Structures are given as structure tokens and as C-alpha cells.
Amino acid sequence: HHAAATETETFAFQAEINQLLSLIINTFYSNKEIFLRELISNSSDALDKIRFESLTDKSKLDAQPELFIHIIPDKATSTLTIVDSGIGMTKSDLVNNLGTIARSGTKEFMEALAAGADVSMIGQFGVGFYSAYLVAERVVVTTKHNDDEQYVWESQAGGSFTVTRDTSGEQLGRGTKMVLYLKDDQMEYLEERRIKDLVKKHSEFISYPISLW
Amino acid sequence: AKYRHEYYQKPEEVVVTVFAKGIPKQNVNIDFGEQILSVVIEVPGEDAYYLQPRLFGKIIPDKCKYEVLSTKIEICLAKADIITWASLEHGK
Amino acid sequence: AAVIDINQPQVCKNKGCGQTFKERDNHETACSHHPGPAVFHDRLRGWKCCDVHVKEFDEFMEIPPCTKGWHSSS
Ligand SMILES: Nc1ncnc2c1ncn2[C@@H]1O[C@H](COP(=O)(O)OP(=O)(O)O)[C@@H](O)[C@H]1O
Ligand SMILES: [Mg+2]
Ligand SMILES: [Zn+2]
Ligand SMILES: [Zn+2]
């Protein structure tokens, strides 16, 4: 019993995810805007999960009774933030799902890209999250699952990521927040109209209210 | 595990034998379902033996029987269908 | 398992069933249910057992049980 083991843990990405990241970051794509659709999809999926769980246990929603997605651009910090009240992720979920396990679609998506497939397919190959690196140089994810405490995952896609217990941040209640630190030439995603048109273009018929702030 | 059991079969019935030696008939509770056998044997000094497999085939409870003998218990299961069971228990 | 009473009513916990059953009456095709799991992925809602995936959550709720098996008290 070590009664203080809540530090900061550092993890290496799986080789195939390092490769995926390098492919995403070092090649030119004319449709980088698809990143927003991918993040909205992940939020929608997470909202579905807690919704489903709640059908057999109404107390599942207690920490946040509303199901929503909030998008918050900030010109002062150059960040685009996306918040949802989905099922959120356990500390284990973070490590397992966001870096440390190469899912089967990863190597498959890389081959599909080399053969001629468009990066827009990334969602179908089980790796849509990493598309955030199309426009961001750094991503921090804070997340809160009913079963666990609030944690923060962070990476600049340099071969590693960290996971840190978040005792001081805002405090989500339940769900996840992704903060994207946009690269210099990607500031267009902070404009209200760009976001509005984009949400309308690729999302539009999602089953949960999206608001812009 | 307290007693072992064996079976043999005929086109229309499966005969299960439980090798339990000097058991008084009143201590033997056996019941039959559509596709399950229930055998519960009380042992005053110890925990009760039970054998309650889901069966490989369907049976006809009303036509099933058993006899408690000096040396063993013989149970006759009436098959619902004329087929050779590959085992006694379902999925085995 | 522990000992059971084949005459005792139970609630089946298989998805899409929830019926009360006895077990003396149970059998290999008694219960119609989705073995599951439910799948919520890339904006589609569905069931991995029958591989039907639908689009609307409410629609997903109407996808009929796909499998006949044993009722299960757990
Ligand atoms: N907003 C979110 N809320 C909860 N979990 C998430 C969120 N975004 C991503 N995840 C987790 O990360 C995993 C990987 O996401 P992604 O790379 O888009 O692949 P996929 O959605 O195909 O599984 C998801 O399966 C999910 O478990
Ligand atoms: Mg995805
Ligand atoms: Zn199904
Ligand atoms: Zn059932």
C-alpha cells in the first residue's frame, strides 16, 4: 500500500499509432475540416452510451441530467474546445483507448491511404480521434466517468502522452472535454461562421443539441 | 462429485445411473423438465449432492421415471425425439 | 452453479425478453432475445449479434430480437 501514488503517468504510443500520427501530421490534405465531424461523432457515440445505460437505471444521469455538445472557440488562447455530457472515460479507458492499444483498423487505414483512399474515411477505421492532429499541434482531453475520478490526457504527438488525475480543473460532472491547440495556419476554425457552416455541412442531423457559445 | 454418474441410451430413452450406495428413498428428490434433469440427494451428516444438467436432447417429463436401488439410482429419460445424443449434458 | 429449484419462477435477463419463466419449462430455443452487445459507433445505433445498425436511437430500440436460446436467470 503506497498511500500517495497519484502522480503523472507517461505512456508511449503503440508503434502503429506513432506511424498513423506521422502520416496525419506530415502529409498535405485539402479537407482537414473533417476533424470537427469526427469529434462530434465521438461525442454523439458517448452520449448514446450513457443514454442507453440510463434506460435501465435513471440514476445514471445524476451528475449531469442534460445530454449536450458545446463548442467553444477562444481567440485569446487560440483553442477550439468541444464538450459533451457523454459517458466519459475511466482512467483505464484513456490509456487503453487513446494510445496504448493499436486497434485492427489502424494498420488497415494506413494501407487504404497508401492505396489512394481519402483521409475522410478515418472514422470508419476506428481511429477518428487522431484526426484532431490535422489542425491541432497539441490536444488535452479532460474526462469524467461515473465510476472514476476526473482525469486529463495530453499529447503533442511526439511519441508519448500523459494521464494525470485532475484535482483542480473546472470539474465536468460527467463527460469529456477536448481542447485543441490550433496550428498557426488553422485559425479559421475559431470563426463562428466557419464552425456554423461546418456543423451544418457534416453534422446537421445529430440527435443531441449542439450549441456554440 | 460426491457420487459419480454414467449413462447409456436406446433409440427412445437415455438411462442415467448415479452410483450412490445406501440411500433411503425419501432422501432422493428427482424432477424432470423439458430439457433438464434435477437430482438432489440429502446426506444428514453433510452437504446435499445435486446433479442438474441441461440435457443434450428434449425429454418427456410425464414418461420419465427412476428407481432407488440398494447400490445405485437408475433414471430413465424418455426422449422427445428419436435421435442419438452425443452426450448427456447440453453443449458437451 | 449452485443448486436450483426448476419449479421456481425467475425473471429472464436476456435483452428483449425479461419474461418470467420456470426452467422446468426452459429449453434451447425458448427465449427470443438479442445476445448483444449493443453498438453505438460513428453515429450508428445497433446490435452486434444480428449486425443491424440503424441511424436513429429510437429506431434502434425497435430492432427485433434476433436469436432463440435458453432463458437465463442471469
Ligand atoms: N468524446 C468522447 N467521450 C467518450 N469516449 C471517447 C470520446 N472520444 C473518443 N472516445 C473513446 O476513444 C475511442 C477511440 O475513438 P476513435 O479513435 O474515434 O475510434 P472509434 O470511435 O472508431 O472507436 C472510442 O471508441 C471511445 O471509447
Ligand atoms: Mg470515432
Ligand atoms: Zn441481435
Ligand atoms: Zn428469456
Author numbering:
A (entry chain A): -2 to 210
B (entry chain C): 150 to 241
C (entry chain E): 148 to 221
The paper states:
Both CHORD and CS domains are independently capable of interacting with the molecular chaperone Hsp90 and can coexist in complexes with Hsp90. The Crystallin and Small heat-shock protein like (CS) domain of Sgt1 plays a key role in these complexes, providing separate binding sites for Hsp90 (Catlett and Kaplan, 2006; Lee et al., 2004) and for Rar1 (Boter et al., 2007), while the SGT1-Specific (SGS) domain of Sgt1 provides the interaction with the leucine-rich repeat domain of plant and mammalian NLRs (Bieri et al., 2004; da Silva Correia et al., 2007; Leister et al., 2005). We have now determined the crystal structure of a ternary complex between the nucleotide binding N domain of Hsp90, the CS domain of Sgt1, and a CHORD domain of Rar1, providing a framework for understanding the architecture of Hsp90-Sgt1-CHORD protein complexes in plants and mammals.
The N-terminal domain of barley (Hordeum vulgare) Hsp90, the CS domain of cress (Arabidopsis thaliana) Sgt1a, and the CHORDII domain of cress Rar1, were expressed, purified, and cocrystallized in the presence of ADP (see Experimental Procedures). The structure was solved by molecular replacement with the structure of the previously determined binary Hsp90-N-Sgt1-CS complex (Zhang et al., 2008), and refined at 2.2 Å resolution (see Experimental Procedures and Table 1). The overall architecture of the Hsp90-N-Sgt1-CS-Rar1-CHORDII (H-S-R) complex is a puckered heterohexameric ring with approximate diad symmetry, and with the subunits in a cyclic a, b, c, a, b, c arrangement, so that each protein contacts only one copy of each of the other proteins. As expected (Heise et al., 2007; Shirasu et al., 1999), Rar1-CHORD is a metallo-protein domain with two structural Zn2+ ions. The core of the interface involves the interaction of Hsp90:Phe49 and Leu52 with a hydrophobic patch formed by the side chains of Rar1:Ala185, Phe187, Trp194, Phe204, Phe207, and Met208, augmented by polar and solvent bridged interactions involving Hsp90:Ser38, Ser41, Asp42, Asp45, Lys46, Arg48, and Ser200, and Rar1:Arg190, Arg192, Glu203, and Asp205.
